[PDB]
RNA sequence: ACUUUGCUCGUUCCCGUUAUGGGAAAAAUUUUGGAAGGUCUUGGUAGGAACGGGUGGAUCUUAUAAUUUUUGAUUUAU
RNA sequence: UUGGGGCCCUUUGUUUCUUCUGCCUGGAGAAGUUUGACACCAAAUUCAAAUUGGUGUUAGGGGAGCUGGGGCCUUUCAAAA
RNA sequence: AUACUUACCUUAAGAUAUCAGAGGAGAGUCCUACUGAUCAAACAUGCGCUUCCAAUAGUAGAAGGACGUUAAGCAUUUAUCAUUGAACUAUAAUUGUUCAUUGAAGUCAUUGAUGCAAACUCCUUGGUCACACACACAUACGGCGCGGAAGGCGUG
RNA sequence: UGGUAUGUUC
């Protein structure tokens, strides 16, 4: 007999063909991915604080510290700290999910763009891309998307697209700035830019 | 005959029958006639001792053990008298019985 | 078994004239139908005749250079013809069940009520009523939308994509039955 | 029957693991499909021989008795196989 | 007729164990698995007169400061070469083989 | 190391202890066990593998010994090529805190079974 | 050992009498076990008992002393 | 109830049982608590919103009542000198 | 979520501590809210028991490390073979010396590897606890405070 | 006498 600890589903006598097919089906994938995400979120979010050790402080430290100054404590209400911590959590997860993708879109017209950056004609890890296609045995998963594939083959040479400026490129993205410190940008530019 | 299809809980009788009338005739003769045997082991530890018990794994209890080995550098023989010993059948190369 | 040594001992004991009823002739020629449906839902149980690998190797060595036996081939042809007749009867029963499901009482009553109201401007109204009746018939047929497999006699689907169909064709039942159809067609081409 | 460690080895399928062999050669790659007998198959394999050199295999398959150990990723630190008092929701008859 | 049940009757016995690596282990027995995975406490272990692998295995167990004194050691079955029992114990009473006596009475 | 390992404990009782397990080579693995089996296959959390070099072995033969430590993290070690296991360091939380944690796990598991019985109805 | 007759010493009380006997308790006191009360300290306070399993997980035996751990090719020697 | 003095506030979401209001001229107020409630993750339904699958929490200290056990003292019964 | 099709499979067994005695069931076996003894588990409980628990009358320090710095620190050791050409020491598949054509793989590492040794900095842990800044001891030390962590022994 | 996974309609 076999029991899945993730899906909480039982099974018959332990056949490798059934157990292999169980770890491919979509319900086990959803339950396993959600369980790993929640356990990682719990071990990040668990603030294991140190146990405090307070000793009887010295006399001259008390005459020095109680005479210098008294600082002001800031504090906020419940909805304010809840909204601020929710914005900080979405900022932490969008920084953990993002990555710099300037070299992919900056060498887009390079003659070896179809041999390294296409990520399907790659030599060492291209067989891993060509192996598991997620073959979409549902007809709705193949009939949902109606856009182009734009699969760049390896055999694209330098004869195609000879002049990269006549074929309309994209203007590069500006360096993004922090929205909390966006009020200190120089409002006057150096040169006159139109449109 | 296959081992799994013989019977249930009667394999001990066949094991005793193989003990009485098989390759175990020398370990049986040494424990009933208290004769000393010489067991050569896989690390040159030759044991002269009397057999006290028999096991399926050839795990043997030995009494009045006189063991001897040889250090080769130069050539010396080092011996030791051990009263009680429980020897594993993994280490046993061979068992010789004297008449 | 729990140990692989007993499995290897079983393989040795089942691996080590020739015209005897104990030897399965359908397995002696090859691809016994009691072997191709061992553990599936269409299982016949257990073959009463014994199967052996040494006799199969001797038959392969004899059919390579020595000779051939037409009696075992005729017995395998008769067994394949009986199994093909049973599968054709099952496929005819499935086709009759599909025809009975397409001709149910309430479905034919609804179709007759739609066609009774189906009767330039009158031709356009009749074409719109015929299109509405065709849409109602498509909605009635889409409640099951189960076709009939032309070879193995199972159920298929038209709106289903080719990947799930290719997963359907790679089974023990379909591979065994296509092999039995190939053997039956080869024996009918050799006999006729 | 099987036990917790072989279930943990079957748990981390499709992840970057690192084996060490009994000879001293350390493999590292993505686990294709583990088995109950620990005869494990790896892909994008980088290998270090006991002599010291580093090479790269595409698709390796090592037998379970010639394995010193294997390193699973750290997110399997928290697994339901490690739970001691996990009850069982009504096994079938 | 496995003699591991003979060692299961040897709790709180102050024995020595020579391993296949060559280490002599002096300590009291606490428990032993039926697969002969024996646990010991109040242990000192010594590699006599060499094997550098055995010297590494002797030192890298904590508590060296070549007699190494350790509090608790579990020993696997296939690493046990031989075990020496104290001579004061009576082997005629501990090898009664009550399971073998019940098997003989069941015959 | 004044730990005073338990006098009548076995592998079910030694769980979550910082073991110092010895192998046939002497490649000592230090880490917390979290599971075992009949073949004594041990998973090891935050594990480190320490060895001694061949040049240090001459100094070790009859002081400071420079061991080579590599970090394995969470590994799973087989029971074939191991020799002996000891208990090196005690865990963080105590026996009473593990008892309260086990009671909380039992109450949470009973609540989960009540939730499965409520969802089944 | 029972039994009787008198002497002597003697725990406590009475009487013939403060020599000494007679009668009674055959006692005051020490220990163990059981019943009750008071005081000091600690844990628990919402589940528990019985039965039923083509129940789940652990432990033992045999398959299993033969290539997958656990019944050995890891003391590097001819 | 007020006032003074000493320490702590890392409780870093300013008590972390939860929700809401709210705080350093202060340390608070209201509600609820195991077939329930709270917070979060993932998704297709083309904002938000709603649905489904899971994860984690429901705490700490003191007091009245009941009960189990350990030690001392007192009363009574049975047995042995 | 209901209804249907398809792909795979449909189960190694026996038992739940041991010994002695009495009774019952047609030499052997089973049962006793049957009796004595040993052992195991759980919950309490005590042993002038065993080990540990970090200054604040200061700006420290105990344990484990740095996969940290000085540090390319100091002292040593290696960084391919074969055929031939112009000389050649020469028992080798010209090994040795200088230069080159060609032939098979060809770890990176020489700021590399091993040994030695000091200093600085930073991480995880604690009772950073209650009274006092005190004249005890050959039977060597009044272990006769509130606890916590690990363990031994004993009782119910 | 059943289980796991997948694809359509409400």
Short mmCIF file of N, CA and C in Angstrom, two decimals, chain E residues 19-59:
data_model
loop_
_atom_site.label_atom_id
_atom_site.label_comp_id
_atom_site.label_asym_id
_atom_site.label_seq_id
_atom_site.Cartn_x
_atom_site.Cartn_y
_atom_site.Cartn_z
N UNK E 19 36.76 -4.77 16.58
CA UNK E 19 36.09 -4.51 15.31
C UNK E 19 36.94 -4.99 14.15
N UNK E 20 36.35 -4.96 12.95
CA UNK E 20 37.08 -5.36 11.75
C UNK E 20 38.13 -4.33 11.35
N UNK E 21 37.97 -3.08 11.77
CA UNK E 21 39.00 -2.07 11.52
C UNK E 21 40.22 -2.31 12.40
N UNK E 22 40.03 -2.91 13.57
CA UNK E 22 41.11 -3.21 14.49
C UNK E 22 40.99 -2.57 15.85
N UNK E 23 39.87 -1.92 16.16
CA UNK E 23 39.73 -1.17 17.40
C UNK E 23 39.14 -2.06 18.49
N UNK E 24 39.73 -2.00 19.68
CA UNK E 24 39.23 -2.71 20.86
C UNK E 24 38.42 -1.74 21.70
N UNK E 25 37.18 -2.12 22.01
CA UNK E 25 36.20 -1.26 22.67
C UNK E 25 35.83 -1.91 23.99
N UNK E 26 36.16 -1.25 25.10
CA UNK E 26 35.87 -1.74 26.45
C UNK E 26 34.69 -0.93 26.98
N UNK E 27 33.58 -1.60 27.25
CA UNK E 27 32.40 -0.89 27.72
C UNK E 27 31.30 -1.85 28.11
N UNK E 28 30.28 -1.30 28.75
CA UNK E 28 29.13 -2.09 29.17
C UNK E 28 28.04 -2.06 28.11
N UNK E 29 27.42 -3.21 27.88
CA UNK E 29 26.33 -3.33 26.93
C UNK E 29 25.04 -2.79 27.53
N UNK E 30 24.28 -2.07 26.71
CA UNK E 30 22.96 -1.60 27.09
C UNK E 30 21.86 -2.36 26.36
N UNK E 31 21.93 -2.39 25.04
CA UNK E 31 20.94 -3.09 24.23
C UNK E 31 21.61 -3.52 22.93
N UNK E 32 20.98 -4.47 22.26
CA UNK E 32 21.45 -4.96 20.97
C UNK E 32 20.23 -5.24 20.10
N UNK E 33 20.30 -4.76 18.86
CA UNK E 33 19.27 -5.04 17.88
C UNK E 33 19.35 -6.51 17.47
N UNK E 34 18.24 -7.08 16.97
CA UNK E 34 18.33 -8.41 16.34
C UNK E 34 19.21 -8.45 15.09
N UNK E 35 19.48 -7.31 14.47
CA UNK E 35 20.49 -7.18 13.43
C UNK E 35 21.87 -6.88 14.00
N UNK E 36 22.02 -7.03 15.33
CA UNK E 36 23.28 -6.92 16.07
C UNK E 36 23.88 -5.51 15.95
N UNK E 37 23.01 -4.51 16.11
CA UNK E 37 23.42 -3.11 16.19
C UNK E 37 23.49 -2.76 17.67
N UNK E 38 24.67 -2.91 18.26
CA UNK E 38 24.81 -2.93 19.72
C UNK E 38 25.20 -1.55 20.24
N UNK E 39 24.51 -1.09 21.28
CA UNK E 39 24.84 0.18 21.91
C UNK E 39 25.62 -0.07 23.19
N UNK E 40 26.58 0.80 23.48
CA UNK E 40 27.47 0.65 24.62
C UNK E 40 27.65 1.99 25.31
N UNK E 41 27.82 1.95 26.63
CA UNK E 41 28.10 3.14 27.43
C UNK E 41 29.28 2.88 28.35
N UNK E 42 29.83 3.98 28.89
CA UNK E 42 31.06 4.00 29.69
C UNK E 42 32.21 3.33 28.94
N UNK E 43 32.56 3.93 27.81
CA UNK E 43 33.37 3.28 26.78
C UNK E 43 34.76 3.89 26.76
N UNK E 44 35.78 3.04 26.69
CA UNK E 44 37.07 3.49 26.19
C UNK E 44 37.52 2.56 25.06
N UNK E 45 37.99 3.16 23.97
CA UNK E 45 38.37 2.42 22.78
C UNK E 45 39.80 2.75 22.41
N UNK E 46 40.51 1.74 21.90
CA UNK E 46 41.95 1.81 21.70
C UNK E 46 42.32 1.07 20.42
N UNK E 47 43.18 1.69 19.61
CA UNK E 47 43.75 1.03 18.44
C UNK E 47 45.16 0.57 18.79
N UNK E 48 45.42 -0.73 18.88
CA UNK E 48 46.73 -1.21 19.31
C UNK E 48 47.75 -1.15 18.18
N UNK E 49 48.95 -1.63 18.48
CA UNK E 49 50.04 -1.65 17.51
C UNK E 49 49.81 -2.71 16.44
N UNK E 50 51.07 2.01 11.37
CA UNK E 50 49.91 1.15 11.54
C UNK E 50 48.80 1.54 10.57
N UNK E 51 47.57 1.16 10.91
CA UNK E 51 46.40 1.49 10.09
C UNK E 51 46.06 2.96 10.31
N UNK E 52 46.31 3.79 9.30
CA UNK E 52 46.02 5.21 9.43
C UNK E 52 44.54 5.53 9.36
N UNK E 53 43.77 4.70 8.65
CA UNK E 53 42.32 4.86 8.61
C UNK E 53 41.72 4.59 9.99
N UNK E 54 42.24 3.57 10.68
CA UNK E 54 41.78 3.28 12.04
C UNK E 54 42.22 4.36 13.02
N UNK E 55 43.39 4.97 12.80
CA UNK E 55 43.82 6.08 13.66
C UNK E 55 42.95 7.32 13.43
N UNK E 56 42.54 7.56 12.18
CA UNK E 56 41.62 8.65 11.90
C UNK E 56 40.25 8.40 12.53
N UNK E 57 39.77 7.16 12.46
CA UNK E 57 38.50 6.81 13.08
C UNK E 57 38.58 6.86 14.60
N UNK E 58 39.77 6.62 15.16
CA UNK E 58 39.96 6.72 16.60
C UNK E 58 39.99 8.17 17.07
N UNK E 59 40.71 9.04 16.36
CA UNK E 59 40.85 10.42 16.83
C UNK E 59 39.61 11.26 16.53
#
